[PDB]
Design a protein around this nucleic acid. Structure first.
Lengths: 314, 268
DNA sequence: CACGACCCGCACGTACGCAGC
DNA sequence: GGCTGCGTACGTGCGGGTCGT
């Protein structure tokens, strides 16, 4: 009798297995993917993608001129990403594979904390949570694209800094953080041409000029030699020192930062507006930082040029 | 790590996935695994290659970026199309953008930059554009140069909307003004040039000089904390004014050395 | 780009442990 | 106690992975 039971408990399980494995591949085609890709997905991936798709549809059901809609994605410098309050990436733009190299299917449904640097987890957790529905922060996220444009295995993944901007929306409570991530380009490898209102500069780790482009002579009036060795914190308009301190902290801790809009006092009085883009240069012998590199955008002409603010202007 | 532990972790993960799916499917809202899978399979046929359509993607992009789309020809900068979201952004109806040129819509100082940017595949710049009912706002443009209709080139870009009784002054560790905001002209009456290079004490009433010196010695030692002090100040009109100065050293974020002491002097 | 070198993942088989007509 | 459905734990086998001299 025990034998017969064991012989009728080794048969039911086979049928159950067969039915489960068949239903799972029944559920793999209904996903919105090409049949070839969906025919080779493991069971965990199928479950993940199905849950993410249902969640996203539930979202757009609460959120919800047809020939020009396809230009929106290509007209963007970056990719979209929807993250729930628990860190689950429930959608990612298809052009993600061009910025990081990880396809959408490889990411969709995974927890965000797995693909970001551990030191930044607290920041992301603070941002995702409704503590202002707007959000703006920097984070590091794994990138498998090499500088030459190749792709490498996840184990050889480097860290890429993404400027995240967006807002958190509450749906009648499910809080989903919608962000548009913009990779900040290395000053070395720049493909976008530079306007006439731009001048390059280099700094030591304490923000003391070590080289400035000659075009600063035309744009602001300072000679390149007058700035070498003088702290860049002396020239910021005192009302922007706090913002620039925050930007410097982020630049040192994370490697790259895009500054706000500040004011750099000009030679003969008055100040011009600026935006800057910072990038740390690492020494590959010891991985120790060497010198900050910057790209400066001048936004306007010298304002209040009859005024004297600092001693260096007299 | 033992194989059995890894297998048990996988089992727990799969059970969590199944529970989530059972919660998600309206019909299930507990059946076994097989029934849940079958119900999900049937449900996903009442919906529905891309995860999201184009209109939904546009909805998400507008919810994330708060911007608008516009197409402008290279040769003359003539607007060839502008989405209906330009109105909420720049309070300007579509009729004011159609037929016009891009240059008419930007601040006069940005015209050279824009003409250099549109000259002849990606493009990215920052320019100010006029607001309707001149007030200007800073907008960051991202787009690319392509042939059109789908020299015949046009830039497809999406504009993202980039987001007195007191005066601020700096000092060295001895008290010499190194930066004085222009509000000093109204607050105390001296021109900014009148104060640069002179110790703050020289303007202080003699009896309260010692308190000011003690405060300047204390704030350099507190090393980060604020320190408020009230003293009489000699104005340009030789009138003694009560003023309050809140000061705290500024320490370089990397070397932690002192750069300068910043004080926010307020007229009481 | 090879081939044993494995090491890691995954999927299946078998059986053990519980309700219940 | 039968024998049925159902879920969970351990071991084994296979293909695709990565080193290495």
């Amino acid at each position: 009798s025990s034998e017969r039971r064991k012989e009728k408990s080794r048969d039911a399980a086979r049928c159950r297995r067969s039915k489960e494995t068949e239903v799972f591949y029944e559920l793999a085609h209904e996903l919105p993917l090409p049949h070839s890709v969906s025919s080779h997905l493991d069971k965990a991936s199928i479950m993940r993608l199905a849950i993410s798709f249902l969640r996203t549809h539930k979202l757009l059901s609460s959120v919800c001129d047809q020939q020009m809609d396809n230009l929106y994605l290509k007209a963007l410098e970056g990719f979209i990403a929807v993250v729930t309050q628990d860190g689950d990436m429930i959608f990612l733009s298809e052009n993600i594979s061009k910025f990081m190299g990880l396809t959408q299917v490889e990411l969709t449904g995974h927890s965000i904390f797995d693909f970001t640097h551990p030191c930044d987890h607290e920041e992301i957790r603070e941002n995702l949570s409704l503590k202002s529905t707007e959000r703006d922060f920097f984070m590091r996220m794994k990138c498998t694209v090499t500088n030459r444009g190749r792709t490498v295995n996840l184990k050889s993944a480097t860290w890429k800094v993404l400027h995240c901007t967006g807002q958190v929306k509450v749906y009648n409570l499910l809080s989903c953080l919608i962000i548009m991530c913009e990779p900040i380009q290395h000053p070395s490898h720049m493909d976008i041409p530079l306007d006439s209102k731009t001048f390059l500069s280099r700094h030591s780790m304490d923000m003391k000029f070590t080289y400035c482009d000659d075009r600063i002579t035309e744009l602001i009036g300072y000679h390149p030699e007058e700035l070498l060795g003088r702290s860049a914190y002396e020239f910021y308009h005192a009302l922007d020192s706090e913002n620039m301190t925050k930007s410097h902290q982020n630049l040192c801790t994370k490697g790259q930062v895009v500054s706000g809009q500040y004011r750099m006092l000009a030679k003969h009085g008055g100040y011009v507006w600026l935006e800057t883009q910072g990038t740390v240069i690492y020494n590959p012998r010891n991985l120790q930082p060497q010198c900050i590199m910057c790209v400066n955008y001048v936004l306007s002409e010298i304002e209040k040029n009859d005024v004297v603010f600092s001693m260096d202007q007299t | 790590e033992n194989h059995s532990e890894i297998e048990r972790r996988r089992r727990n993960k799969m059970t969590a996935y199944i529970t989530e799916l059972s919660d998600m499917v309206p019909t299930c809202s507990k059946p076994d695994k097989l029934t849940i899978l079958r119900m999900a399979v049937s449900h996903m046929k009442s919906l529905r290659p891309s995860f999201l359509t184009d209109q939904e993607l546009k909805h998400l992009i507008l919810e994330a970026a708060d911007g608008f789309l516009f197409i402008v020809s290279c040769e003359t900068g003539r607007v060839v199309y502008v989405s209906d979201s330009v109105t909420p952004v720049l309070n300007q109806p579509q009729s004011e953008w159609f037929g016009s040129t891009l240059y008419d819509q930007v601040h006069p100082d940005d015209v050279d930059k824009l003409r250099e940017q549109l000259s002849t595949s990606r493009r990215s710049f920052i320019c100010r554009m006029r607001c309707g009912s001149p007030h200007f706002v800073v907008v960051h443009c991202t787009g690319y140069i392509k042939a059109w209709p789908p020299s015949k080139f046009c830039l497809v870009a999406i504009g993202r909307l980039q987001v007195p009784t007191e005066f601020i002054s700096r000092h060295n560790i001895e008290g010499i003004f190194t930066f004085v905001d222009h509000r000093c002209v109204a607050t105390v009456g001296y021109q900014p040039q009148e104060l640069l290079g002179k110790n703050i004490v020289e303007f202080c009433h003699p009896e309260d000089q010692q308190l000011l010196r003690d405060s300047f010695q204390q704030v350099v030692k507190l090393k980060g904390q604020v320190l408020s002090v009230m003293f009489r100040f000699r104005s340009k009109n030789q009138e003694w004014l009560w003023m309050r100065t809140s000061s705290f050293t500024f320490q370089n974020p990397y070397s932690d050395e002192i750069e300068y002491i910043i004080c926010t002097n307020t007229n009481v």
